[PDB]
Design a protein around this ligand. Structure first.
Ligand code: CLA
Ligand code: CLA
Ligand code: CLA
Ligand code: CLA
Ligand code: CLA
Ligand SMILES: CC(=O)O[C@H]1CC(C)(C)C(=C=C/C(C)=C/C=C/C(C)=C/C=C/C=C(C)/C=C/C=C(\C)C(=O)C[C@@]23O[C@]2(C)C[C@@H](O)CC3(C)C)[C@](C)(O)C1
Ligand code: KC2
Ligand code: KC2
Ligand code: KC2
Ligand code: KC2
Ligand SMILES: CC1=C(C#C/C(C)=C/C=C/C(C)=C/C=C/C=C(C)/C=C/C=C(C)/C=C/[C@@]23O[C@]2(C)C[C@@H](O)CC3(C)C)C(C)(C)C[C@H](O)C1
Ligand SMILES: CC1=C(C#C/C(C)=C/C=C/C(C)=C/C=C/C=C(C)/C=C/C=C(C)/C=C/[C@@]23O[C@]2(C)C[C@@H](O)CC3(C)C)C(C)(C)C[C@H](O)C1
Lengths: 228, 211, 238
């Protein structure tokens, strides 16, 4: 049973706490689908949230402390000394659009039947591995590197080690979620995360609005900027 | 190489220490008084981590003793009689000028940037020659994390297939056989000594830096 | 434990009194889990109060006699010294003059210990069970054996293992002494705080316990700017 697998996974994550579902979301019938499909959805959502939160935390240290690529690019319109909430606000509108669009294409490839079937897998709600990004083996143009393990460092890793790695992924993703929203919360309700008192600056602007402020409308292309 | 870049463990096949009992044996051998002093409990780890800690301790011992002797010499002011720059149409700088720059930290600071880069490059070359598993296995050992002796520097002079394109005259450790043949366990006595004076030189060099 | 075993314990603690429950709180079923569970909870509460009160008695004596630590409590160019916390006033005033982070960290460390004790999985890993399920009424489990990711150097009870290899008779005698010394130290620390708030309440300590204005059953003082602290402190009480 998918619930039994989830409870065992929770025990692996933390045997002191074990399975901790105070709302019974694992028993909620999302979309009227059975418990196995709903648990697949919830595990995929947990892993996805955790992954993106870990990337968000590392990128918060990168942007706020000051870590930029050189050359012509979106980096040249963000003011120096800008804080992590102003970096996204300051990049060009096309940069925001194309970042979100590329993330969307990756989501689409993640849930497409074509790639998951070419990799001999199924959708995470239809008896598949929750949190599996397929190789780009069904994209039209042959694609150099895959998303997960692009250099294939885990081509020969034990299944037990992979299971432990997924157990690590869930826990570290949860903790990264807590830290990243600690950073966000300290800027819109000061004195909420006591350690960050005085570190994170206040930010006047809706975090959850992606395209506000719209940012500059510059044209950063140089050679062949006929569209300007 | 890509088959060995596993990021994971493989079974050990040597008598190197891979447990707390083995660590305790070496601990009493180093010093019967203290024994194993592991408050953080980094003996309760995997064989690869134990070997990693052992090699890290040994390497800190090497660098710390070398640093302490270099600090003492540079404080004594026994500079070199050569010129350190100015042969390919560059400015002239002398080891006397480097010495007169100040204390040994100031001397390193006064050292020119490409000189620093070249020194660090040689040290990195030595480091990766140490880490090369293929070189150790052409020689008689493995990577310290995967059951090798912690501290072994492979020979830089050789005629095997894994030999440099140009012949190298001598090796890093024991270039002229000053070790020659210690007895089969007097080498181990010297290893115990090395760990002890390495720890002492570690404390000494950090104390001097603090002062 | 059962009422018979509790009576045996009381007889061993003082063979003249024996079982002394004028309220019959042992028969008072609370938590609706049987007399065994109720007696387990009451015994755990007695032992925990005894331990905390004995430690607090020694802490009050040490702090009230000007024996602050040499090192600092807060770090920075302008950090509150342990000497400054001493000069804040009497021991309760020292606690109230602590930084908010210091108070929070102390009480949350204690809370983590309390959750660690309450967990039946950790207790089972250490052996024995919950105090309300047939376990030893006061028994802190092993922080090492529980399975914290980093191996802790020492456990909380008997870190250096000086009570290790103790005779079982010595163990039972020690748990009797723990309960009794607890029972007395509770009154000791409460009398210290009572002389602090109401002078002359405990007649013996006259002028030897410093005064105190704020409420003693109030971990957070006016200096602690956390949600609702000032609103809670707005109205004092006897
Ligand atoms: C949106 C993020 C998200 C998602 C999709 C999940 C998904 C899951 N978590 Mg949760 N979890 C999260 C964040 C999230 N978690 C965070 C930040 C933490 C750290 C505080 C945890 C800590 C945690 C534990 C310790 C356990 C779970 C478990 C679960 C399962 C469902 C029961 C539950 O707690 O509902 C998740 C809660 C929500 C979806 C949020 C509901 C919305 C309101 C506003 C709150 C499922 C795998 C249990 C499980 O089966 O583990 C394998 C379990 O034991 N989670
Ligand atoms: C712009 C394109 C795009 C597209 C097509 C999708 C598509 C999806 N996302 Mg989203 N997502 C996007 C961008 C996008 N995402 C971005 C930029 C982020 C941040 C990096 C996320 C972060 C995210 C998370 C954390 C989750 C989703 C999930 C989902 C699913 C539900 C969406 C929904 O019903 O929203 C209606 C409005 C779906 C597969 C959920 C999912 O897959 O659950 C298993 C989910 O948990 N997305
Ligand atoms: C480009 C040069 C170079 C290279 C390739 C290495 C490589 C290495 N050094 Mg380093 N090291 C360097 C310069 C370099 N070192 C210099 C100039 C010194 C001063 C003598 C040291 C002194 C040093 C010590 C003392 C130690 C290392 C260690 C290591 C290892 C891990 C480093 C790591 O993960 O850092 C973080 C990323 C690795 C074999 C560690 C080791 O031996 O691990 C077992 C270790 O403890 N190095
Ligand atoms: C019973 C609980 C208790 C409580 C609530 C407090 C509360 C306080 N103590 Mg502590 N204290 C206690 C027991 C306690 N103490 C005991 C038993 C002793 C005797 C060793 C002390 C000795 C002591 C000193 C000397 C000082 C404090 C100070 C403080 C303040 C900050 C915390 C700190 O750093 O203390 C550190 C205390 C501990 C870690 C003790 C923990 C309790 C156990 C029983 C200790 C056993 C092991 C021992 C350390 C060896 C605060 C008012 C500081 C202060 O007020 O400055 C003026 C200060 O300088 N306390
Ligand atoms: C957040 C921190 C925290 C947590 C989770 C706990 C948890 C607990 N404490 Mg408490 N305790 C704390 C801080 C905390 N304590 C501190 C800082 C101290 C000072 C040293 C104590 C001193 C203490 C003593 C002396 C006793 C407890 C007891 C208890 C237990 C009974 C709870 C109960 O029914 O109270 C009712 C809970 C509420 C009214 C909720 C308030 C919010 C429980 C394990 C008692 C126990 O074990 O009884 C068997 C007990 O004897 N605690
Ligand atoms: C958008 C835009 O405009 O961006 C701007 C900003 C940006 C991006 C920052 C820019 C930049 C900087 C960049 C990209 C710099 C790149 C630098 C680079 C790429 C530096 C490599 C050094 C490698 C070395 C020394 C290797 C030696 C290697 C050796 C010794 C060997 O060959 C050995 C060996 O192989 C042999 C010969 C063959 C075999 O027998 C044996 C082996 C295998 C052992 C640009 C250019 O300004 C553009
Ligand atoms: C920013 C994003 C991101 C972060 C920060 C992150 C961090 C960690 C950590 C660190 C705490 C661990 C220890 C860990 C472990 C594993 N990750 Mg993960 N990961 C991210 C992204 C992806 C993607 C896209 C995939 C993936 C996977 C796996 C597998 C499965 C291997 C297998 O079963 O073959 C294992 C063991 C692949 C998969 O199939 O997951 C079901 C997969 O496609 N990860 N991952
Ligand atoms: C991971 C995300 C990502 C992907 C996968 C991706 C793919 C493609 C493809 C697909 C094959 C094409 C054909 C394409 C083309 C252009 N991209 Mg694009 N791009 C991504 C990200 C960004 C960012 C951040 C920026 C950017 C831009 C431009 C400009 C316009 C330059 C200009 O008008 O000066 C052009 C012509 C820049 C921009 O619009 O700057 C105002 C800019 O900052 N892209 N991009
Ligand atoms: C500047 C750096 C440096 C210093 C300051 C230093 C000092 C001392 C002292 C102090 C008085 C003693 C007594 C001593 C003794 C031994 N050193 Mg050592 N040593 C340094 C560097 C290297 C390198 C690179 C290697 C090495 C080794 C050995 C072996 C093993 C021989 C064998 O069994 O083959 C023995 C007995 C080799 C090895 O395998 O070490 C595990 C090896 O590669 N040493 N070493
Ligand atoms: C503030 C903290 C504190 C104080 C100041 C304190 C004082 C005294 C005194 C003097 C007044 C005596 C004479 C005494 C004796 C014993 N204490 Mg004790 N104790 C404290 C805390 C704990 C904790 C956490 C545990 C514990 C225990 C034992 C055992 C073990 C018996 C066994 O092994 O069966 C014996 C004999 C452990 C246990 O198992 O108790 C059932 C246990 O977990 N104590 N304890
Ligand atoms: C490597 C890697 C990955 C990655 C990645 C990332 C971040 C990739 C991002 C790629 C990106 C951002 C690629 C932009 C391309 C832009 C193009 C082609 C623009 C053409 C522009 C053209 C053709 C313009 C032409 C003209 O103006 C010209 C010159 C003059 C006239 O004659 C004609 C006109 C006017 C039309 C994976 C796969 C995600 C995961 C894997 O694990 C590892
Ligand atoms: C400027 C210019 C010109 C020029 C020039 C030229 C040709 C310049 C050449 C410079 C050159 C050739 C510079 C070498 C440095 C080598 C160093 C520092 C080696 C250290 C080596 C060390 C420290 C080695 C140590 C050991 O090996 C020992 C001793 C024994 C071994 O057991 C162990 C190890 C390996 C550790 C022209 C031709 C005049 C005209 C032109 O127009 C412009």
């Amino acid at each position: 049973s998918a619930k039994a697998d989830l409870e065992a996974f929770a025990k692996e994550c933390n045997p002191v706490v074990g399975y901790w579902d105070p709302l019974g979301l694992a028993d909620l019938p999302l979309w009227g689908q059975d418990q196995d499909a709903v648990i697949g959805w919830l595990r995929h959502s947990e892993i996805k949230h955790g992954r993106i939160a870990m990337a968000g935390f590392v990128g918060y240290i990168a942007h706020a402390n000051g870590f930029r690529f050189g050359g012509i690019g979106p980096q040249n319109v963000v003011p120096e000394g800008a804080s992590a909430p102003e970096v996204w606000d300051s990049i060009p509108f096309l940069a925001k659009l194309q970042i979100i669009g590329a993330i969307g294409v990756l989501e689409h490839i993640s849930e497409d039947k074509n790639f998951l079937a070419a990799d001999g897998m199924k959708h995470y709600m239809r008896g598949g591995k929750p949190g599996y990004f397929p190789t780009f083996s069904a994209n039209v143009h042959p694609m150099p590197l895959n998303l997960f393990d692009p250099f294939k460092w885990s081509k020969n890793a034990s299944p037990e080690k992979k299971a432990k790695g997924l157990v690590t992924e869930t826990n570290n993703g949860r903790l990264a979620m807590l830290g990243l929203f600690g950073f966000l919360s300290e800027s819109k309700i000061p004195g909420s995360v006591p350690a960050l008192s005085g570190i994170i600056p206040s930010y006047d602007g809706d975090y959850m609005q992606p395209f506000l402020p719209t940012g500059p409308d510059t044209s950063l292309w140089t050679i062949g900027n006929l569209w300007a | 190489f890509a088959d060995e870049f596993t990021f994971d463990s493989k079974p050990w096949s040597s008598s190197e220490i891979k447990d707390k009992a083995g660590l305790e044996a070496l601990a009493k051998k180093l010093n019967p008084t203290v024994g194993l002093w592991d408050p953080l409990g980094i003996a309760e780890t995997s064989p690869e981590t134990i070997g990693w800690f052992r090699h890290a301790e040994i390497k800190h011992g090497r660098v710390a003793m070398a640093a302490f002797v270099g600090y003492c010499v540079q404080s004594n002011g026994i500079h070199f009689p050569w010129n350190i720059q100015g042969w390919q149409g560059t400015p002239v700088v002398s080891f006397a000028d480097i010495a007169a720059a100040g204390g040994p930290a100031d001397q390193w600071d006064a050292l020119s940037t490409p000189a620093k880069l070249q020194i660090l490059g040689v040290i990195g070359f030595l480091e990766m020659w140490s880490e090369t598993s293929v070189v150790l296995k052409a020689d008689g050992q493995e990577h310290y994390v995967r059951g090798g002796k912690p501290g072994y520097f492979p020979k830089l002079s050789r005629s095997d297939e894994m030999a440099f394109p140009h012949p190298v005259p001598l090796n890093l450790w024991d270039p002229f056989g000053f070790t020659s043949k210690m007895t089969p366990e007097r080498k181990e006595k010297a290893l115990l000594a090395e760990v002890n004076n390495g720890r002492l030189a570690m404390i000494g060099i950090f104390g001097m830096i603090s002062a | 434990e059962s009422k018979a075993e509790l009576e045996s314990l009381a007889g061993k603690l003082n063979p003249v009194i024996g079982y002394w429950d004028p309220l019959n709180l042992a028969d008072y079923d609370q938590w609706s889990q049987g007399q065994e569970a109720a007696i387990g909870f009451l015994r755990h509460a007695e032992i925990k109060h005894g331990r905390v009160a004995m430690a607090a008695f020694v802490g009050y004596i040490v702090q009230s006699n000007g024996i602050c630590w040499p090192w600092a409590l807060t770090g920075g160019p302008n950090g509150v010294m342990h000497s400054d916390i001493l000069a804040a006033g009497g021991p309760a005033d020292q606690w109230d003059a602590l930084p908010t982070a210091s108070k929070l960290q102390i009480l949350l460390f204690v809370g983590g210990l309390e959750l660690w004790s309450e967990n039946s999985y950790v207790l089972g890993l250490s052996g024995e069970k919950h105090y309300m399920r047939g376990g030893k009424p006061g028994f802190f489990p092993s922080i090492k054996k529980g399975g914290i990711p980093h191996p802790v150097p020492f456990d909380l009870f008997d870190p250096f293992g000086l009570s290790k290899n103790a005779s079982p008779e010595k163990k039972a005698k020690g748990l009797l002494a723990e309960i009794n010394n607890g029972r007395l130290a509770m009154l000791g620390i409460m009398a210290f705080v009572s002389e602090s708030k109401v002078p002359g309440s405990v007649p013996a300590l006259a002028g030897k316990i410093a005064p105190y204005s704020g409420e003693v059953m109030a971990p957070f003082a006016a200096s602690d700017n956390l949600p609702f602290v000032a609103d809670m402190l707005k109205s004092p009480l006897f």
